[PDB]
Design a protein around this motif. Structure first.
Motif, PDB file in Angstrom:
ATOM      1  N   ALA D  44       0.694  -1.205  -0.459  1.00 51.65           N
ATOM      2  CA  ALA D  44      -0.122   0.169   0.159  1.00 51.65           C
ATOM      3  C   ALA D  44       0.906   1.318   0.040  1.00 51.65           C
ATOM      4  CB  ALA D  44      -0.931   0.001   1.479  1.00 51.65           C
ATOM      5  N   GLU D  45       1.774   1.395   0.729  1.00 58.06           N
ATOM      6  CA  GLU D  45       2.660   2.305   0.837  1.00 58.06           C
ATOM      7  C   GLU D  45       3.386   2.495  -0.027  1.00 58.06           C
ATOM      8  OE1 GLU D  45       5.812   0.332   3.936  1.00 58.06           O
ATOM      9  OE2 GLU D  45       5.808   2.265   4.380  1.00 58.06           O
ATOM     10  N   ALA D  46       3.476   1.162  -0.402  1.00 58.09           N
ATOM     11  CA  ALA D  46       4.893   1.117  -2.284  1.00 58.09           C
ATOM     12  C   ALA D  46       3.728   2.433  -3.289  1.00 58.09           C
ATOM     13  CB  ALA D  46       5.196   0.387  -2.415  1.00 58.09           C
ATOM     14  N   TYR D  47       2.361   1.740  -3.478  1.00 61.42           N
ATOM     15  CA  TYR D  47       1.532   1.702  -4.812  1.00 61.42           C
ATOM     16  C   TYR D  47       0.700   2.811  -4.718  1.00 61.42           C
ATOM     17  CZ  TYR D  47       3.059  -2.126  -6.967  1.00 61.42           C
ATOM     18  OH  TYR D  47       3.631  -3.199  -7.954  1.00 61.42           O
ATOM     19  N   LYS D  48       1.146   3.513  -3.077  1.00 63.38           N
ATOM     20  CA  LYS D  48      -0.355   4.739  -2.903  1.00 63.38           C
ATOM     21  C   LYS D  48      -1.486   4.604  -1.956  1.00 63.38           C
ATOM     22  CE  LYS D  48       2.834   7.610  -5.326  1.00 63.38           C
ATOM     23  NZ  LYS D  48       3.643   7.943  -6.342  1.00 63.38           N
ATOM     24  N   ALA D  49      -1.896   2.885  -3.387  1.00 62.12           N
ATOM     25  CA  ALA D  49      -3.261   2.875  -2.507  1.00 62.12           C
ATOM     26  C   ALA D  49      -3.660   2.565  -1.843  1.00 62.12           C
ATOM     27  CB  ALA D  49      -3.845   1.644  -4.228  1.00 62.12           C
ATOM     28  N   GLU D  50      -4.620   2.306  -1.044  1.00 61.94           N
ATOM     29  CA  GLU D  50      -5.513   1.949   0.046  1.00 61.94           C
ATOM     30  C   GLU D  50      -4.860   0.733   0.270  1.00 61.94           C
ATOM     31  OE1 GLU D  50      -9.302   2.414   2.326  1.00 61.94           O
ATOM     32  OE2 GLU D  50      -9.606   4.345   0.797  1.00 61.94           O
ATOM     33  N   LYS D  51      -4.785  -0.090   1.747  1.00 62.08           N
ATOM     34  CA  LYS D  51      -4.625  -0.196   2.460  1.00 62.08           C
ATOM     35  C   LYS D  51      -5.153  -1.925   1.610  1.00 62.08           C
ATOM     36  CE  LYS D  51      -4.363  -3.218   5.571  1.00 62.08           C
ATOM     37  NZ  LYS D  51      -5.043  -4.245   7.012  1.00 62.08           N
ATOM     38  N   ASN D  76      -7.370  -1.148  -8.244  1.00 61.79           N
ATOM     39  CA  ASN D  76      -7.746   0.231  -8.313  1.00 61.79           C
ATOM     40  C   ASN D  76      -8.844   1.411  -7.388  1.00 61.79           C
ATOM     41  OD1 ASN D  76      -5.727   0.702 -10.793  1.00 61.79           O
ATOM     42  ND2 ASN D  76      -7.910   0.224 -12.281  1.00 61.79           N
TER      43      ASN D  76
END
Ligand SMILES: [Mg+2]
Ligand SMILES: [Mg+2]
Ligand SMILES: [Mg+2]
Ligand SMILES: [Mg+2]
Ligand SMILES: [Mg+2]
Ligand SMILES: [Mg+2]
Ligand SMILES: [Mg+2]
Ligand SMILES: [Mg+2]
Ligand SMILES: [Mg+2]
Ligand SMILES: [Mg+2]
Ligand SMILES: [Mg+2]
Ligand SMILES: [Mg+2]
Ligand SMILES: [Mg+2]
Ligand SMILES: [Mg+2]
Ligand SMILES: [Mg+2]
Ligand SMILES: [Mg+2]
Ligand SMILES: [Mg+2]
Lengths: 182, 144, 53, 134
Positions: D44-51, D76
């Motif tokens: 999540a941290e890597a990809y900016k997307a929610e956990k 997405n």
RNA sequence: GAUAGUGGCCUACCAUGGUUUCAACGGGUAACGGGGAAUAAGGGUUCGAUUCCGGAGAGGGAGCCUGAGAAACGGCUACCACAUCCAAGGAAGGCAGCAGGCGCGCAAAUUACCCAAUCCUAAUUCAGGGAGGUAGUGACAAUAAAUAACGAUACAGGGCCCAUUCGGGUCUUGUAAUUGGAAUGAGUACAAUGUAAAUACCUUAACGAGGAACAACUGGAGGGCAAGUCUGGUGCCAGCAGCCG
């Protein structure tokens, strides 16, 4: 009714059980390379025989004929990779002259012994079984692993275990503990 | 020369002749007539269970002399009566009348063993437990 | 009884509590040592189990 | 050192399921087993997307430790994750909740029982009552 | 005529053919056919109930309904065989599906969890699936391999500086209930994986080796055939011995 799984018997017993000279030879071989069984020896022999069968067949076909040129060549390459054939003898005719010793002198056992790290073959075997010794940062448990010549440069102790530098573990640790509050 | 026909179109004769000859080969004959099923006390099977009628000592053939300690058994599957040798020194006094017993062949493929005349079968298990086990005192006979 | 007399007769001698044999690869090693490393006391025709008499 | 060097290898971008699918290769050093939740968080941290828009499954340790290889999908939106991801996985994650069935045998038995009556058995009940009485 | 249609497939009239020592016909099969399997110089020999492909059958024989498709049996109708429930008027049956029981036998497993995968079915992304998967039992077979490793001291063998007699033993080996620190998974077990949920694996905190343990058996020691004319007992007996003995 699921698709059947393939088994293969990987060794062959001798056709005559108490051939005394043969037995003694086997024993000698075992002594040399710290072999748990005659079974291991038999396995090796079987492997050799398979190779021989292939080679003979290839020879039987005309030279410069496609199949021989291909399959035989591939076999030769494989042998060289494993480190059983020498660079002098990439020939297919030399493949028939191999003999059991060259396979045994290529196990992760013998290799381990011959690079230091051991003091005798038995010790090496023990180390291997005991999860010391890694190849490409991959801990190898298997004594009869067949070292692939280019990977032979990389045989070392693990990043886990002692010997290769980590936590001492079990007996040493216990000793340390004992020392501690006394 | 040579008794057989050789010609490139003989084939049939070679086949039929071979077939004819095959019947002189005893094993083949046995296989084909099916004498393992029709005759033979075991119905062409490796083992058979029977009930002990009585214990009979049998006098061995010549050079030798010794009472052999065999057992008259009637097999469960068909009802045929057979003699069965009880191996090892004690062992006969593990058997008793009216006892269920597992018999194997002797190891001669239907033929009699050694010096024991008319006996073609071993005793392997009495009342469900191995004779060998009893002998070595690894288990006990759980009555009858 | 006729049957099983000899066994009955024999003195019930018990097995001596021994140091255990080192089973497996160790055993093989031991065997090797006994035979082809040491080569101890060779008559020409090399014997395996000699009688102590 | 704990390190936990995480890697996303073999990245297929999948618009048809509104996700990114990849082989997760994670390094351990001296630490045994990464735990799924932690891995998810990292992703999540890597990809900016929610956990909750992250899903990781099917892990195996290298043998002799050091590495873990598994499979990872990053959807997405959370909505997308909800409507494409298998229910069990969702439950595991903590988004969807456990469906409360009886043991399948019981269900089967019930079905069989139902088979034995034609229509809703209210009339049947009445019959049982009155007939039982007299 | 009948059939979806060809055809003695059946019917009427007519003709006298058809098959066969290159085995017709009959008999047997402890015969489902094939892919294949075991063996393994070359040629062969034996096996193939069984995971794929055909074919048959749902206790035995018939006969049909519905339907695109069945002469269907987890459809129906009858008879024969075997059998349940019964208030004796009647009523229901068909595990060569899965599980399980009895029987037969030399001979073969749990009345478990689930549709997550593989696919299939339906009006259908959703429901269903003992198809299928998942564990349980499982020395059927097959693969990999633990049951110790390296040291010291204490008695012997082997190279020998030299062999006035030794001997140091400078160098190498084996053997002792001598003794010494190291290593470890077999187990357990926090966890985290795994997984539909779990086991187990793979990964690991914590425990976990010194002989009495964390103990390898199975068969042999006249020959064939590797290995004793060792020690007791037995005395042509008990027994062994595939064969010779
Ligand atoms: Mg470790
Ligand atoms: Mg049949
Ligand atoms: Mg056949
Ligand atoms: Mg078949
Ligand atoms: Mg059959
Ligand atoms: Mg039946
Ligand atoms: Mg029918
Ligand atoms: Mg049924
Ligand atoms: Mg059906
Ligand atoms: Mg069944
Ligand atoms: Mg069985
Ligand atoms: Mg099934
Ligand atoms: Mg088990
Ligand atoms: Mg023994
Ligand atoms: Mg004996
Ligand atoms: Mg003896
Ligand atoms: Mg001999």
């Amino acid at each position: 009714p699921r698709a059947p799984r393939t088994y293969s018997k990987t060794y062959s017993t001798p056709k005559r059980p108490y051939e005394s000279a043969r037995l003694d030879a086997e024993l000698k071989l075992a002594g040399e390379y710290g072999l748990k069984n005659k079974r291991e020896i038999y396995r090796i022999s079987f492997q050799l025989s398979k190779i021989r069968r292939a080679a003979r067949d290839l020879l039987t076909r005309d030279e410069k004929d496609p199949k021989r040129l291909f399959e035989g060549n591939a076999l030769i390459r494989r042998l060289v990779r494993i480190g059983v054939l020498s660079e002098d003898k990439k020939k297919l005719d030399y493949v028939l002259a191999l003999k059991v010793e060259d396979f045994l002198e290529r196990r992760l056992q013998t290799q381990v012994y011959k690079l230091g790290l051991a003091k005798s073959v038995h010790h090496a075997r023990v180390l291997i079984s005991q999860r010391h010794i890694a190849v490409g940062k991959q801990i190898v448990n298997i004594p009869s692993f067949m070292v692939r010549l280019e990977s032979e440069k990389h045989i070392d102790f693990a990043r886990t275990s002692p010997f290769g530098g980590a936590r001492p573990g079990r007996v040493a640790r216990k000793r340390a503990a004992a020392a501690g509050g006394e | 020369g040579k008794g057989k026909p050789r010609g490139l179109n003989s084939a049939r004769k070679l086949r039929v002749h071979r077939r004819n000859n095959r019947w002189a080969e005893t094993t083949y004959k046995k296989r084909l007539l099916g004498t393992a099923f029709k005759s033979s006390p075991f119905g062409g099977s490796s083992h058979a269970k029977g009930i002990v009628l009585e214990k009979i000592g049998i006098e061995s053939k010549q050079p030798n002399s010794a009472i052999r300690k065999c057992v008259r058994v009637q097999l469960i599957k068909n009802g045929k009566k057979v003699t069965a040798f009880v191996p090892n020194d004690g062992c006969l006094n593990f058997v008793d009348e009216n006892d269920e017993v597992l018999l194997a062949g002797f190891g001669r493929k239907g033929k009699a063993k050694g010096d024991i005349p008319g006996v073609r079968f071993k005793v392997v298990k009495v009342s469900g437990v191995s004779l060998l086990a009893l002998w070595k005192e690894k288990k006990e006979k759980p009555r009858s | 009884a006729r049957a099983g007399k000899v066994k009955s007769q024999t003195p019930k001698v018990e097995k001596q509590e021994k140091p255990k044999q080192p089973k497996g690869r160790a055993y093989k090693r031991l065997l090797y040592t006994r035979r082809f490393v040491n080569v101890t006391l060779t008559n020409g025709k090399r014997k395996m189990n000699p009688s102590p008499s | 050192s704990d390190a936990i060097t995480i890697r996303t290898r073999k990245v297929i971008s999948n618009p048809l399921l509104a996700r990114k699918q990849f082989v997760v290769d994670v390094l351990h050093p001296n630490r045994a087993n990464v735990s799924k939740d932690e891995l998810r968080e990292k992703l999540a941290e890597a990809y900016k997307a929610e956990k909750d828009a992250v899903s990781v499954f099917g892990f195996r340790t290298q043998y002799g430790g050091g590495k873990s290889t598994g499979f990872g999908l990053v959807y997405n939106s959370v909505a997308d994750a909800k409507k494409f991801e298998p229910a069990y996985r969702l439950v595991r994650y903590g988004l969807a909740e456990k469906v409360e069935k009886a043991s399948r045998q019981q269900r089967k038995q019930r079905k069989n029982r139902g088979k034995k009556i034609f229509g809703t058995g209210k009339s049947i009940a009445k019959k049982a009552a009155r007939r039982n009485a007299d």
